[PDB]
Design a binder for this molecule. Structure first.
Ligand SMILES: CO[C@H]1CC[C@@]2(Cc3ccc(-c4cncnc4)cc3[C@@]23COC(N)=N3)C[C@@H]1C
Length: 377
């Protein structure tokens, strides 16, 4: 600077293509698969017959559709989308037994937005109004949901990974069968993205010893719509140097660490044990108190099953000029509670995370960490 035990297993997807939930829009209801995205704030759905789409929102068939007479052009890093703003009745079949009138951006043109071969047709932006397009007056879906119903102002995500991937989005609550041990909370620094503060970073218990502002330059966010653990350039360089040193029993090309090439091992091998564990200490709920979340190589070394030329992997930790992004590689190790009502995010060891006989993902605390307020950019 529609009970919780009907919401378990309501998410699906394919490797690297994100997680989606089934939703219905309009009257009579039109079924659509929608990407769950904690890194954005618009409910944007394909509304034209793009050849890649299995289905799309047909506004002419909805008696409850209302036109907002406003368009939006949304450029981003990787592509763009253009939409026509409107409102309609929205429901989540494997969610709460409610129907809400929400803002919907009917996508009429796009570039590198929809994925060739994916099974989703829209995006559910679960973040705050501050980052909604075109401005903060366009109420996000979750804000409409809580304002129009008795649904508690909270949601939780268990992203399991694996190929078909699966998980759970518990809307309005927490399902205690989705995690082991205790939930540990980090404050939401500002209600725009789900912004958090990282106070310390360790590779196999070894501190990176950097000025903690570097870990949050210019922000640190929790984003279900991003695959990688993205780190600020300076942090990435120190983390890679430490990971290289920890795994020095086997040498890999420079391109592997930069995500420019895959590394392959025999059909049943993979030396998980040579790769270090990665710990992120998050600001706690109390003055000078923190906790740490720990991920395994099973989270940050992603298998690539698309290879047509051996078991090949992609290093899923990458450099970022937009700050730290705690994507799927972080989230797949944990049960994540987006406690909007208390402006905090809870982490707990996921009951579905991929691990081995020697190591497990961990959420531990409390730790004493001084000057935590100084870590925020
Ligand atoms: C309001 O407009 C938002 C809409 C949302 C994206 C666009 C997008 C498309 C696909 C996926 C995508 C692909 N594969 C897998 N997962 C997600 C992600 C995004 C974004 C970028 O980053 C995050 N968080 N969301 C950013 C954009 C500014």
């Amino acid at each position: 600077a529609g009970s919780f035990v009907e919401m378990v297993d309501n998410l699906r997807g394919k490797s690297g293509q994100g997680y989606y939930v089934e939703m219905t829009v309009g009257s009579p209801p039109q079924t659509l698969n929608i990407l769950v995205d904690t890194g954005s704030s618009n409910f944007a759905v394909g509304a034209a017959p793009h050849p890649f789409l299995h289905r799309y929102y047909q506004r002419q068939l909805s008696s409850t559709y209302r036109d907002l007479r406003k368009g939006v052009y949304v450029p981003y890093t990787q592509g763009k989308w253009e939409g026509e703003l409107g409102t309609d009745l929205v429901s989540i079949p494997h969610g709460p037994n409610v129907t809400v009138r929400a803002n919907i951006a009917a996508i009429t043109e796009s570039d590198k937005f929809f994925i060739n071969g994916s099974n989703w047709e829209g995006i559910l932006g679960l973040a705050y109004a501050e980052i909604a397009r075109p401005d903060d007056s366009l109420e996000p879906f979750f804000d409409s949901l809580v304002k129009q119903t008795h649904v508690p102002n909270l949601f939780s995500l268990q992203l399991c990974g694996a190929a078909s991937v699966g998980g759970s989005m518990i809307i309005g609550g927490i399902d205690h069968s989705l995690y082991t041990g205790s939930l540990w909370y980090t404050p939401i620094r500002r209600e725009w993205y789900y912004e958090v503060i990282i106070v310390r970073v360790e590779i196999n218990g070894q501190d990176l010893k950097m000025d903690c502002k570097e870990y949050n330059y210019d922000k640190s966010i929790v984003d279900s719509g991003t695959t990688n653990l993205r780190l600020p350039k300076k942090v990435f360089e120190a983390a890679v140097k430490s990971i290289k040193a920890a795994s020095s029993t086997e040498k890999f090309p420079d391109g592997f660490w930069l995500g420019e090439q895959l590394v392959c091992w025999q059909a049943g091998t993979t030396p998980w044990n040579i790769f270090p564990v990665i710990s992120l200490y998050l600001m706690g709920e109390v003055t000078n108190q923190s906790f740490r979340i720990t991920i395994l190589p099973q989270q940050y070394l992603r298998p690539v099953e698309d290879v047509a030329t051996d078991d090949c992997y992609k290093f899923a930790i990458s450099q970022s000029s937009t700050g730290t992004v705690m994507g799927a590689v972080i989230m797949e190790g944990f049960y994540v509670v987006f406690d909007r009502a208390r402006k905090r995010i809870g982490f707990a060891v996921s009951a579905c995370h991929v691990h081995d006989e020697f190591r497990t993902a961990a959420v531990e605390g409390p730790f004493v960490t001084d000057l935590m307020e100084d870590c925020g950019y």
